[PDB]
Symmetry: C3
Subunit: 119 residues, 3 copies
Protein backbone atom coordinates (compact mmCIF):
# COMPACT_ATOMS: atom_id res chain seq x y z
CA UNK A 1 0.00 0.00 0.00
CA UNK A 2 0.99 3.63 -0.37
CA UNK A 3 2.43 3.96 3.18
CA UNK A 4 4.46 0.80 2.86
CA UNK A 5 5.95 2.10 -0.44
CA UNK A 6 6.72 5.36 1.39
CA UNK A 7 8.49 3.43 4.10
CA UNK A 8 10.44 1.31 1.57
CA UNK A 9 11.68 4.59 0.09
CA UNK A 10 12.67 5.79 3.57
CA UNK A 11 14.57 2.53 4.01
CA UNK A 12 16.70 3.05 0.85
CA UNK A 13 16.86 6.87 0.54
CA UNK A 14 16.59 8.01 4.19
CA UNK A 15 17.72 11.54 3.38
CA UNK A 16 15.01 12.54 0.84
CA UNK A 17 11.39 13.16 1.53
CA UNK A 18 8.68 11.00 0.08
CA UNK A 19 7.38 14.34 -1.33
CA UNK A 20 10.53 14.76 -3.51
CA UNK A 21 9.43 11.64 -5.36
CA UNK A 22 5.74 12.40 -5.42
CA UNK A 23 5.89 15.05 -8.18
CA UNK A 24 8.93 14.57 -10.41
CA UNK A 25 9.23 14.27 -14.14
CA UNK A 26 6.54 12.80 -16.35
CA UNK A 27 6.00 9.63 -14.37
CA UNK A 28 6.84 10.08 -10.66
CA UNK A 29 3.71 10.18 -8.61
CA UNK A 30 1.54 11.18 -11.51
CA UNK A 31 1.29 11.07 -15.28
CA UNK A 32 1.44 8.00 -17.49
CA UNK A 33 2.82 9.37 -20.74
CA UNK A 34 5.57 11.24 -22.51
CA UNK A 35 9.29 10.68 -22.71
CA UNK A 36 10.91 10.09 -19.29
CA UNK A 37 12.99 13.18 -18.38
CA UNK A 38 15.96 11.41 -16.75
CA UNK A 39 17.01 8.11 -15.18
CA UNK A 40 15.07 8.70 -11.97
CA UNK A 41 11.89 9.31 -14.06
CA UNK A 42 12.62 6.05 -15.92
CA UNK A 43 12.51 4.24 -12.55
CA UNK A 44 9.00 5.66 -12.07
CA UNK A 45 7.95 4.62 -15.57
CA UNK A 46 9.06 1.00 -14.91
CA UNK A 47 7.14 1.12 -11.54
CA UNK A 48 4.01 2.33 -13.33
CA UNK A 49 4.28 -0.48 -15.87
CA UNK A 50 4.80 -2.89 -12.95
CA UNK A 51 1.57 -1.76 -11.21
CA UNK A 52 -0.36 -2.11 -14.43
CA UNK A 53 0.75 -5.67 -14.70
CA UNK A 54 -0.29 -6.39 -11.06
CA UNK A 55 -3.74 -4.93 -11.77
CA UNK A 56 -4.41 -7.77 -14.07
CA UNK A 57 -4.93 -9.93 -10.94
CA UNK A 58 -8.65 -9.74 -10.01
CA UNK A 59 -9.26 -7.25 -7.23
CA UNK A 60 -5.58 -6.24 -7.00
CA UNK A 61 -5.40 -2.50 -6.21
CA UNK A 62 -1.74 -1.49 -5.64
CA UNK A 63 -2.03 1.68 -3.48
CA UNK A 64 -4.54 -0.02 -1.28
CA UNK A 65 -3.06 -3.49 -1.03
CA UNK A 66 -1.23 -4.34 2.19
CA UNK A 67 1.77 -6.65 1.98
CA UNK A 68 4.53 -8.29 4.08
CA UNK A 69 8.01 -6.92 3.64
CA UNK A 70 10.89 -5.95 5.86
CA UNK A 71 13.54 -3.26 5.91
CA UNK A 72 16.52 -4.55 7.92
CA UNK A 73 17.96 -1.12 7.66
CA UNK A 74 18.89 -0.40 4.05
CA UNK A 75 17.88 -3.90 3.05
CA UNK A 76 14.45 -4.77 1.62
CA UNK A 77 12.72 -8.19 1.44
CA UNK A 78 9.20 -9.17 0.44
CA UNK A 79 8.13 -11.95 2.80
CA UNK A 80 6.89 -15.38 1.66
CA UNK A 81 3.45 -15.07 3.30
CA UNK A 82 2.07 -12.78 0.54
CA UNK A 83 -0.77 -13.75 -1.84
CA UNK A 84 -0.31 -13.16 -5.62
CA UNK A 85 -1.39 -9.51 -5.64
CA UNK A 86 0.60 -8.69 -2.51
CA UNK A 87 3.75 -10.35 -3.69
CA UNK A 88 3.57 -8.64 -7.03
CA UNK A 89 2.97 -5.19 -5.56
CA UNK A 90 5.68 -5.70 -2.99
CA UNK A 91 8.10 -6.57 -5.76
CA UNK A 92 7.19 -3.49 -7.76
CA UNK A 93 7.73 -1.23 -4.70
CA UNK A 94 11.03 -2.93 -3.73
CA UNK A 95 12.62 -2.64 -7.20
CA UNK A 96 11.56 1.06 -7.50
CA UNK A 97 12.94 1.93 -3.99
CA UNK A 98 16.29 0.41 -4.92
CA UNK A 99 16.10 2.13 -8.40
CA UNK A 100 15.47 5.52 -6.68
CA UNK A 101 18.50 5.01 -4.39
CA UNK A 102 20.94 4.81 -7.32
CA UNK A 103 19.55 7.45 -9.69
CA UNK A 104 20.72 11.00 -9.33
CA UNK A 105 18.00 13.54 -8.36
CA UNK A 106 17.80 16.58 -10.68
CA UNK A 107 16.17 19.47 -8.75
CA UNK A 108 15.13 20.93 -12.08
CA UNK A 109 12.78 17.98 -12.79
CA UNK A 110 10.78 18.48 -9.61
CA UNK A 111 7.18 19.74 -9.93
CA UNK A 112 7.53 20.35 -13.69
CA UNK A 113 4.96 21.55 -16.20
CA UNK A 114 3.41 18.38 -17.61
CA UNK A 115 2.14 20.21 -20.60
CA UNK A 116 5.65 21.50 -21.45
CA UNK A 117 7.71 18.33 -20.88
CA UNK A 118 5.39 15.40 -21.24
CA UNK A 119 4.94 15.01 -24.97
CA UNK B 1 -13.41 2.73 -5.30
CA UNK B 2 -10.78 4.68 -7.20
CA UNK B 3 -9.45 1.65 -9.14
CA UNK B 4 -12.90 0.52 -10.15
CA UNK B 5 -13.65 4.05 -11.48
CA UNK B 6 -10.34 3.87 -13.37
CA UNK B 7 -11.39 0.57 -14.88
CA UNK B 8 -14.86 1.89 -15.80
CA UNK B 9 -13.08 4.67 -17.70
CA UNK B 10 -10.89 2.09 -19.44
CA UNK B 11 -14.07 0.24 -20.40
CA UNK B 12 -15.63 3.29 -22.14
CA UNK B 13 -12.55 5.28 -23.31
CA UNK B 14 -9.96 2.51 -23.87
CA UNK B 15 -7.64 4.81 -25.82
CA UNK B 16 -7.04 7.54 -23.17
CA UNK B 17 -5.09 7.20 -20.00
CA UNK B 18 -6.71 7.55 -16.62
CA UNK B 19 -4.06 10.30 -16.12
CA UNK B 20 -5.60 12.43 -18.94
CA UNK B 21 -8.70 12.70 -16.77
CA UNK B 22 -6.94 13.10 -13.47
CA UNK B 23 -5.90 16.75 -13.97
CA UNK B 24 -8.20 18.53 -16.43
CA UNK B 25 -10.13 21.73 -16.12
CA UNK B 26 -11.49 23.06 -12.85
CA UNK B 27 -13.17 19.88 -11.73
CA UNK B 28 -11.48 16.76 -13.15
CA UNK B 29 -9.55 14.97 -10.49
CA UNK B 30 -9.26 18.02 -8.31
CA UNK B 31 -10.88 21.35 -7.53
CA UNK B 32 -14.48 21.95 -6.51
CA UNK B 33 -15.12 25.47 -7.76
CA UNK B 34 -15.13 27.88 -10.65
CA UNK B 35 -16.84 27.80 -14.01
CA UNK B 36 -16.39 24.47 -15.85
CA UNK B 37 -14.02 25.03 -18.81
CA UNK B 38 -15.75 22.78 -21.37
CA UNK B 39 -18.22 19.90 -21.66
CA UNK B 40 -15.76 17.29 -20.41
CA UNK B 41 -15.14 19.44 -17.28
CA UNK B 42 -18.93 19.65 -16.82
CA UNK B 43 -19.01 15.83 -16.66
CA UNK B 44 -16.51 16.05 -13.79
CA UNK B 45 -18.55 18.71 -12.02
CA UNK B 46 -21.69 16.50 -12.16
CA UNK B 47 -19.57 13.55 -10.83
CA UNK B 48 -18.33 15.69 -7.94
CA UNK B 49 -21.88 16.71 -7.08
CA UNK B 50 -22.85 13.03 -7.30
CA UNK B 51 -20.15 11.98 -4.77
CA UNK B 52 -21.22 14.71 -2.40
CA UNK B 53 -24.71 13.36 -2.44
CA UNK B 54 -23.45 9.78 -1.74
CA UNK B 55 -21.45 11.07 1.23
CA UNK B 56 -24.63 11.87 2.97
CA UNK B 57 -24.98 8.11 3.64
CA UNK B 58 -23.27 7.37 7.00
CA UNK B 59 -19.79 5.99 6.51
CA UNK B 60 -19.96 6.23 2.69
CA UNK B 61 -16.50 7.18 1.38
CA UNK B 62 -16.54 7.11 -2.46
CA UNK B 63 -12.83 6.60 -3.37
CA UNK B 64 -12.57 3.88 -0.80
CA UNK B 65 -15.87 2.11 -1.28
CA UNK B 66 -15.80 -1.16 -3.22
CA UNK B 67 -18.78 -2.00 -5.40
CA UNK B 68 -20.14 -4.62 -7.85
CA UNK B 69 -20.24 -3.63 -11.48
CA UNK B 70 -19.36 -5.19 -14.80
CA UNK B 71 -17.87 -4.04 -18.07
CA UNK B 72 -19.04 -6.42 -20.82
CA UNK B 73 -16.68 -4.66 -23.11
CA UNK B 74 -17.88 -1.12 -23.70
CA UNK B 75 -20.97 -1.77 -21.63
CA UNK B 76 -21.26 -0.87 -17.93
CA UNK B 77 -23.71 -2.24 -15.32
CA UNK B 78 -23.87 -1.77 -11.55
CA UNK B 79 -24.91 -5.12 -10.09
CA UNK B 80 -27.93 -5.62 -7.80
CA UNK B 81 -25.90 -6.95 -4.84
CA UNK B 82 -24.70 -3.46 -3.79
CA UNK B 83 -25.65 -1.75 -0.50
CA UNK B 84 -26.90 1.90 -0.58
CA UNK B 85 -23.47 3.54 -0.56
CA UNK B 86 -22.06 1.10 -3.11
CA UNK B 87 -24.95 1.41 -5.48
CA UNK B 88 -24.85 5.17 -5.34
CA UNK B 89 -21.11 5.39 -5.92
CA UNK B 90 -21.29 2.86 -8.71
CA UNK B 91 -23.95 4.94 -10.39
CA UNK B 92 -21.90 8.11 -10.10
CA UNK B 93 -18.85 6.37 -11.67
CA UNK B 94 -20.91 4.74 -14.46
CA UNK B 95 -22.62 7.98 -15.59
CA UNK B 96 -19.27 9.89 -15.57
CA UNK B 97 -17.47 7.13 -17.60
CA UNK B 98 -20.20 7.29 -20.23
CA UNK B 99 -20.15 11.16 -20.06
CA UNK B 100 -16.34 11.14 -20.64
CA UNK B 101 -16.75 8.86 -23.69
CA UNK B 102 -18.91 11.39 -25.55
CA UNK B 103 -17.24 14.69 -24.64
CA UNK B 104 -14.43 15.95 -26.79
CA UNK B 105 -11.01 16.21 -25.04
CA UNK B 106 -9.35 19.65 -25.38
CA UNK B 107 -5.56 19.21 -24.89
CA UNK B 108 -5.41 22.84 -23.86
CA UNK B 109 -7.50 22.17 -20.71
CA UNK B 110 -5.10 19.55 -19.37
CA UNK B 111 -3.06 20.41 -16.26
CA UNK B 112 -4.24 24.04 -16.25
CA UNK B 113 -3.49 26.83 -13.81
CA UNK B 114 -6.30 26.68 -11.26
CA UNK B 115 -5.63 30.18 -10.15
CA UNK B 116 -5.97 31.51 -13.73
CA UNK B 117 -9.07 29.58 -14.88
CA UNK B 118 -10.99 28.60 -11.81
CA UNK B 119 -12.77 31.77 -10.77
CA UNK C 1 -9.19 8.72 7.42
CA UNK C 2 -9.15 11.28 4.63
CA UNK C 3 -12.97 11.67 4.47
CA UNK C 4 -13.28 12.08 8.20
CA UNK C 5 -10.62 14.84 8.12
CA UNK C 6 -12.60 16.45 5.28
CA UNK C 7 -15.72 16.33 7.40
CA UNK C 8 -13.92 17.75 10.46
CA UNK C 9 -12.90 20.68 8.25
CA UNK C 10 -16.51 21.09 7.12
CA UNK C 11 -17.51 21.13 10.79
CA UNK C 12 -15.17 24.05 11.66
CA UNK C 13 -14.93 25.98 8.35
CA UNK C 14 -18.32 25.24 6.72
CA UNK C 15 -17.91 28.01 4.14
CA UNK C 16 -14.65 26.85 2.45
CA UNK C 17 -14.20 23.85 0.26
CA UNK C 18 -11.97 20.99 1.24
CA UNK C 19 -10.24 21.76 -2.11
CA UNK C 20 -9.14 25.24 -0.85
CA UNK C 21 -7.03 23.42 1.73
CA UNK C 22 -5.83 20.64 -0.51
CA UNK C 23 -3.26 22.71 -2.44
CA UNK C 24 -2.08 25.71 -0.41
CA UNK C 25 1.37 26.86 0.49
CA UNK C 26 4.31 24.53 0.96
CA UNK C 27 2.60 22.12 3.30
CA UNK C 28 -1.18 22.00 2.75
CA UNK C 29 -2.17 18.81 1.05
CA UNK C 30 1.26 18.22 -0.37
CA UNK C 31 4.92 19.01 0.13
CA UNK C 32 6.98 18.38 3.25
CA UNK C 33 9.64 21.07 3.06
CA UNK C 34 10.47 24.73 2.79
CA UNK C 35 9.51 27.70 4.90
CA UNK C 36 5.76 27.86 5.64
CA UNK C 37 4.25 30.76 3.64
CA UNK C 38 1.78 32.05 6.26
CA UNK C 39 -0.03 31.03 9.44
CA UNK C 40 -2.48 28.75 7.66
CA UNK C 41 0.48 26.90 6.05
CA UNK C 42 2.03 26.59 9.52
CA UNK C 43 -1.13 24.74 10.64
CA UNK C 44 -0.50 22.26 7.81
CA UNK C 45 3.14 21.87 8.78
CA UNK C 46 2.18 21.02 12.40
CA UNK C 47 -0.42 18.50 11.02
CA UNK C 48 2.24 16.88 8.85
CA UNK C 49 4.58 16.57 11.83
CA UNK C 50 1.65 15.12 13.80
CA UNK C 51 0.99 12.39 11.18
CA UNK C 52 4.65 11.48 11.12
CA UNK C 53 4.57 10.92 14.82
CA UNK C 54 1.43 8.70 14.51
CA UNK C 55 3.17 6.62 11.85
CA UNK C 56 5.58 5.42 14.41
CA UNK C 57 2.77 3.15 15.70
CA UNK C 58 3.03 -0.20 13.83
CA UNK C 59 0.57 -0.38 10.96
CA UNK C 60 -0.79 3.14 11.58
CA UNK C 61 -1.61 4.74 8.21
CA UNK C 62 -3.28 8.14 8.78
CA UNK C 63 -5.25 8.72 5.53
CA UNK C 64 -6.56 5.21 5.68
CA UNK C 65 -7.25 4.85 9.38
CA UNK C 66 -10.88 5.13 10.48
CA UNK C 67 -11.60 6.72 13.85
CA UNK C 68 -14.45 7.74 16.20
CA UNK C 69 -15.11 11.44 16.52
CA UNK C 70 -18.12 13.71 16.56
CA UNK C 71 -18.99 17.15 15.28
CA UNK C 72 -21.82 18.55 17.43
CA UNK C 73 -22.02 21.38 15.00
CA UNK C 74 -18.89 23.49 15.24
CA UNK C 75 -17.61 21.35 18.08
CA UNK C 76 -15.19 18.44 17.60
CA UNK C 77 -14.48 15.50 19.95
CA UNK C 78 -12.43 12.34 19.47
CA UNK C 79 -14.34 9.54 21.19
CA UNK C 80 -12.86 7.27 23.88
CA UNK C 81 -13.37 4.02 21.92
CA UNK C 82 -10.32 4.64 19.66
CA UNK C 83 -7.17 2.45 19.65
CA UNK C 84 -3.71 4.15 19.83
CA UNK C 85 -3.37 4.86 16.11
CA UNK C 86 -6.96 6.05 15.80
CA UNK C 87 -6.82 8.32 18.77
CA UNK C 88 -3.59 9.87 17.62
CA UNK C 89 -4.81 10.48 14.08
CA UNK C 90 -8.08 11.85 15.34
CA UNK C 91 -6.20 14.28 17.52
CA UNK C 92 -4.02 15.44 14.65
CA UNK C 93 -7.11 16.06 12.44
CA UNK C 94 -9.04 17.84 15.23
CA UNK C 95 -6.24 20.29 16.11
CA UNK C 96 -5.64 21.12 12.40
CA UNK C 97 -9.41 21.70 11.73
CA UNK C 98 -9.55 24.13 14.63
CA UNK C 99 -6.19 25.71 13.49
CA UNK C 100 -7.64 26.21 9.95
CA UNK C 101 -10.75 27.92 11.39
CA UNK C 102 -8.72 30.72 13.00
CA UNK C 103 -6.04 31.37 10.36
CA UNK C 104 -6.75 33.85 7.64
CA UNK C 105 -6.84 32.40 4.07
CA UNK C 106 -4.57 34.23 1.59
CA UNK C 107 -5.91 33.59 -1.96
CA UNK C 108 -2.43 34.28 -3.25
CA UNK C 109 -1.02 31.17 -1.51
CA UNK C 110 -3.42 28.80 -3.24
CA UNK C 111 -2.01 26.39 -5.85
CA UNK C 112 1.46 28.01 -5.74
CA UNK C 113 4.63 27.06 -7.56
CA UNK C 114 6.46 24.72 -5.19
CA UNK C 115 9.70 25.28 -6.96
CA UNK C 116 9.42 29.08 -6.51
CA UNK C 117 8.24 29.26 -2.87
CA UNK C 118 9.32 26.08 -1.19
CA UNK C 119 13.00 26.56 -0.52
NA1 LIG D 1 21.41 7.48 -18.26
NA1 LIG E 1 -21.43 22.37 -25.25
NA1 LIG F 1 1.54 35.35 12.29
Amino acid sequence: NLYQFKNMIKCTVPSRSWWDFADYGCYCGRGGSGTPVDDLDRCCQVHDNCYNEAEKISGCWPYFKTYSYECSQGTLTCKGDNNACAASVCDCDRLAAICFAGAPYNDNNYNIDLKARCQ
